[PDB]
Design a protein around this ligand. Structure first.
Ligand SMILES: Nc1ncnc2c1ncn2[C@@H]1O[C@H](C[C@@H](N)CC[C@H](N)C(=O)O)[C@@H](O)[C@H]1O
Length: 443
């Protein structure tokens, strides 16, 4: 028949959508909310997960609808109200709910947000429900029609067109597909691939091994990591294929001294240690103390013992660890994350233009800090998970202009050429991984 969501399910997505605003990446929020409200059933877990990503993906469009109905941007409203309104608008417009579900929205959702806030906000929600269910979707503008096809803001659509041209439609298709796959890396230091595959297939988990990096596995969700034997023993870590390639490209050797200039939560720095076979030294810098504690949790659980974590600004060092002291440095630079809009769909709506240039300047000063850490024979790898030239090819052309003395080491495997020859790019619509950029440099 139709879509029937139980009361605990209604409270679940509301809390997930609310927490998704303050906990990033939003997957952690979804996990937290689902365990809080006891979503044990796989069928409910699937349905609510699908709705979760549908809301994230269409957030900006949903908000425009809320503004038409309510009269103001939902951004000035209470967080629980905003979350409830987003859930209700998405369910009413897209998911054709059964009478029981609309009843649970009316009574159980109103009550839930009241208990988290004040009776008046539940009442206000209750007063809006009928307007939402009677709302006639009306895309008038050629701009509004465009935004509804790609599920993206006009500025982003325009900016992608300037980069991909004919491929723009395919790009948005690939970041719009659903799709329930999670990418993980097998910790070779503590387990082997087939053993992990078998343990996953021992559960009801569908597994597909990556052809580009055989330690990467795609698993079909939902998958509980805090009850997983493989995860709690440190055999597996969540990482995209593109991110795994980064460490392999830099190619750190056992006994070398390596720097991960922006390291937390530690997907790549933990991978660098595998390639160095738990020998040598890794200096791991990150300004975020709360992200660094995750890296420390991963390091010891995964049996890593060569990582020295440093909660400091990465523009410092030199004169923290030394000048030309690194055999090779990885700069997986803080960035816009625009290449990850398939994985974290809501980012397409939260991104600004401004701050593309703000991130671009930070990357350059980390890049200058990286340059001075590299030994004469050493190598520097610069990566972002951004698709913008401003953060990528532009930042490398600048680097090759001011430095003296680096040169670009040509890259081919396993992805495609970037817009500067010798650089490499991954694309969602070409490679089924996140948008990514690679620049390998040596003195
Ligand atoms: N100036 C800075 N110094 C050190 N870390 C920074 C600085 N600016 C941003 N960061 C960190 O850069 C990180 C960006 C992430 N893309 C790093 C991911 C990491 N390389 C991984 O593979 O797990 C965030 O954790 C930021 O806290």
């Amino acid at each position: 028949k139709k879509l029937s969501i139980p009361p605990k399910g209604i409270r679940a997505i509301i809390e997930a959508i609310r927490l998704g605003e303050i906990i990033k990446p939003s997957q952690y929020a979804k996990r937290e909310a689902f365990k809080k409200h006891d979503v044990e059933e796989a069928w409910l877990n699937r349905v609510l997960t699908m709705i979760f990503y549908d809301i994230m993906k269409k957030q900006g469009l949903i908000d425009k609808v809320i503004k038409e109905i309510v009269g103001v941007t939902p951004l000035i409203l209470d967080p629980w109200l905003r979350a409830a309104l987003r859930v209700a608008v998405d369910i009413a417009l897209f998911h054709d709910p059964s009478s029981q579900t609309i009843k649970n929205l009316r009574w159980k959702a109103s009550d839930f947000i009241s208990s988290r806030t004040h009776p008046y906000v539940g009442m206000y929600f209750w007063d809006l429900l009928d307007k939402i269910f009677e709302y006639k979707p009306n895309p008038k503008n050629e701009l509004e029609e465009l935004e509804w096809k790609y599920l993206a803001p006009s500025w982003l659509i325009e900016r992608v067109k300037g980069i991909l041209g004919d491929e723009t439609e395919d790009f948005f298709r690939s970041v719009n597909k659903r799709h329930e796959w999670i990418s993980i890396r097998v910790n070779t230091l503590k387990a082997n691939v087939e053993e992990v595959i078998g343990e996953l297939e021992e559960d009801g988990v569908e597994v597909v091994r990556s052809e580009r990096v055989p330690t990467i596995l795609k698993i079909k969700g939902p998958y509980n990591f805090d009850t997983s034997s493989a995860f709690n023993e440190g055999k597996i870590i969540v990482q995209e294929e593109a991110s795994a390639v980064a460490s392999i490209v830099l190619d750190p050797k056992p006994g070398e001294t390596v720097v991960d200039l922006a390291a937390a939560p530690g997907g790549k720095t933990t991978h660098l240690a595998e390639l160095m076979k738990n020998k040598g030294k890794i200096y791991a810098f990150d300004v975020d103390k709360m992200r660094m504690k995750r890296l420390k949790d991963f390091v010891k659980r995964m049996g890593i013992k060569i990582v020295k974590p440093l909660v400091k600004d990465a523009r410092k060092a030199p004169e923290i660890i030394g000048e030309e002291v690194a055999d090779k440095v990885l700069l997986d630079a803080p960035c816009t994350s625009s290449g990850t809009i398939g994985k974290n769909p809501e980012l397409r709506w939260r991104l600004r233009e401004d701050k593309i240039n703000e991130m671009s300047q930070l990357q350059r000063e980390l890049l200058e800090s990286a340059a001075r850490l590299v030994k004469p024979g050493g190598r520097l790898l610069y990566t972002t998970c951004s698709i913008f030239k401003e953060e990528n090819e532009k930042n490398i052309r600048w680097f090759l202009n001011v430095h003296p003395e680096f040169k670009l080491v040509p890259l081919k495997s396993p992805y495609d050429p970037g817009f500067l020859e010798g650089t490499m790019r991954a694309w969602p619509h070409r490679h089924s991984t996140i948008g990514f950029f690679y620049a390998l440099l040596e003195k």
